[PDB]
Amino acid sequence: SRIHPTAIIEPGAQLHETVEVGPYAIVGSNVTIGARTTIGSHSVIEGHTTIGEDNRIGHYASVGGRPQDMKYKDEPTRLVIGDRNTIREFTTIHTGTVQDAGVTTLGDDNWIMAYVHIGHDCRVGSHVVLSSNAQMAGHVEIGDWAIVGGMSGVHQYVRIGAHSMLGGASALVQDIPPFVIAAGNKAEPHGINVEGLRRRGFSPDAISALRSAYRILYKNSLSLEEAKVQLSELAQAGGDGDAAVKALVDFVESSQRGIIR
Amino acid sequence: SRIHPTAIIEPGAQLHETVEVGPYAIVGSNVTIGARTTIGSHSVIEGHTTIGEDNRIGHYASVGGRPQDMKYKDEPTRLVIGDRNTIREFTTIHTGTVQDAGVTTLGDDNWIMAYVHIGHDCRVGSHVVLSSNAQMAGHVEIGDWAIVGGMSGVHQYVRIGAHSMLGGASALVQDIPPFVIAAGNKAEPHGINVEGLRRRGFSPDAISALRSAYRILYKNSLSLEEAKVQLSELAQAGGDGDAAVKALVDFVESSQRGIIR
Amino acid sequence: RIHPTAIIEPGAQLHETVEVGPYAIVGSNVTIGARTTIGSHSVIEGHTTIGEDNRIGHYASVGGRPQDMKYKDEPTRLVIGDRNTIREFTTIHTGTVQDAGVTTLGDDNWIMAYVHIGHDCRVGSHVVLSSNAQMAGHVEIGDWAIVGGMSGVHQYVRIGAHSMLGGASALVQDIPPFVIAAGNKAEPHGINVEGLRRRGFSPDAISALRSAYRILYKNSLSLEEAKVQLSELAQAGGDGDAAVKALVDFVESSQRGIIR
């Protein structure tokens, strides 16, 4: 049996014929699951939840549970998950709220370790690593390739930029710009994520441009507005780093909570 | 049917006819559950445990497990939970120890989020919010309406005053006085919980008296002895704030671990 | 003894006296020795060997695969000894072929709820891991060590025997044996005197260790100077000499360095 005889697939659940479901797991009536996804023993998949293909969901995974927001009134809010995600034990990923945009999202190729909590209305990209017991409150955005260290907590509405890194045992209450390492309680910036950018194929010129960008943003007493002018010009320098610097200034121009400093 | 056929209700458990119990849940022989309480799938309710009415206990909730105290020798100690509590996933609430009063207590209208841990002999009031992965070691008192932020740890024997707030990712090793906001590792005081109090119906004059009390206690260079005298006088001003200030000074005077500074 | 709803995969080797509660699962490569009990909903898997007189609670994930992205399904191992208490929502993982292929726990350990023991950890005996203490890969924990609740331990850190880590601490370097540490990040705060007394260390041995602590941390010595002076104390033939030797051998073998 691809579906264990002790699993409960509630009428209405839509599972591709190739989906495997382990013992004592439950799949709710409003769940849709794509090809080759596996669900481990004791997991509960619920909510108005769409899961993609080739996902490896472990034991005791709570996927699609309702928001922990006291304003939630049982609205059929949504959770959408892409492909090739690894989701480990004692994880929680919640659906959205009608006060925001009604949907929590997770992309592709993510690595979600044990005890990780993804609150209502989060938007997580692709190739993200969420280490053990990393916990995000509502409406957190996490860009592609970001790494969140273990036993870290992230405040509601915070944005974590693409290719950024949050050290373990950190408390993050403002935005991490893309490409930046942050750490501490509360978390502060500590340079460009050089090791990460090297492993991902960024050139020494692109990395060197981002080091300049970091200096401009943090180490010259520039106001955020003054920094944006300088960063915008650096983004047009004609170098390997142009696109990366443009992503940085687009992220800082759009910050709600402001950025860590 | 209200009790899922795969749920195990041990002979001797006393459930009101309207209690619902989901798949693969277990309810122990010494458990009592009152009207309209729902127990989610995979949950284990055990110990000498009394649960009230209209409680919403989610999946994978461990309610009434034995103390994690090396002195515990399988005594039939108790856990008492009131009415209208919401208890989410991967939660742990333990019975008491015979070295204290043999009981852990939770009142009514509490919001207990995922990964929350309530150790032996805790005394939790009503309208309390315990955010995700807030963990309380043994013998912690939590006053009505208090809020504890996510990923926060509270040392054994700490008291959390009514209407106080502890920020996320904080470590609390001394008492938080009622009406006070605190944050950090270790946690320090950061003023009166002004907006909380206003939303709960505290008058402008009551809040102003509490702001004055906060300065007396923390900002005016007074010894603890001098602050207690001045607080005792402020509590007799004849204003709306009198009862709140009295509660504050009565709390300060009863502290055994001391108050946060 | 085995609840009818428990799933014991063919191949699992359980002593006749092992008890297994409702809805628990024991994998085909697991061995479990005499008088060990497994609570409801627990999943015991991997190439896992568990000893005698263990008390494993509900929702215990024991023998799960490494969270290392390099893991490719190799038959790596977890070994647990005797008389361990392992509480709820715990995770203990097997090893990786990039280290020595095995995660190990000794005897008489107290493993509280939400504790995480990552791949390739090596945990001794009489260790207390308090609620939600989490250890990344390749963490070594010496005998009698106590790790406080909601603390995180970086990969490859070594916790010395008889040490203590306070709650809500973040440990990124080694704790020498016999030392108290606390904070985010964790810093040293003296010899664990109360611990040593309870465990039978003599007053002379404790005084030697306090002297050793000052040499290492309080006397403005370089590491190289401190090591020579600790070695000279270890050679002086007093009660406590073996303990001081253990300290300097630990400091000399540190890869990540010691907390300061």
Side-chain angles (χ1 to χ4, degrees), chain C residues 164-165 169-171 179-190 213 217 259-260:
Chain C
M164 184 148 23
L165 186 59
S169 290
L171 186 61
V179 172
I180 299 170
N184 182 339
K185 304 311 193 282
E187 299 179 67
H189 293 295
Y213 186 92
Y217 285 126
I259 61 180
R260 210 175 272 271

Side-chain angles (χ1 to χ4, degrees), chain B residues 242-257:
Chain B
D242 282 12
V245 172
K246 186 172 207 309
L248 174 63
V249 74
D250 283 348
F251 183 98
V252 173
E253 293 191 332
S254 54
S255 188
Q256 296 181 38
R257 300 184 58 88

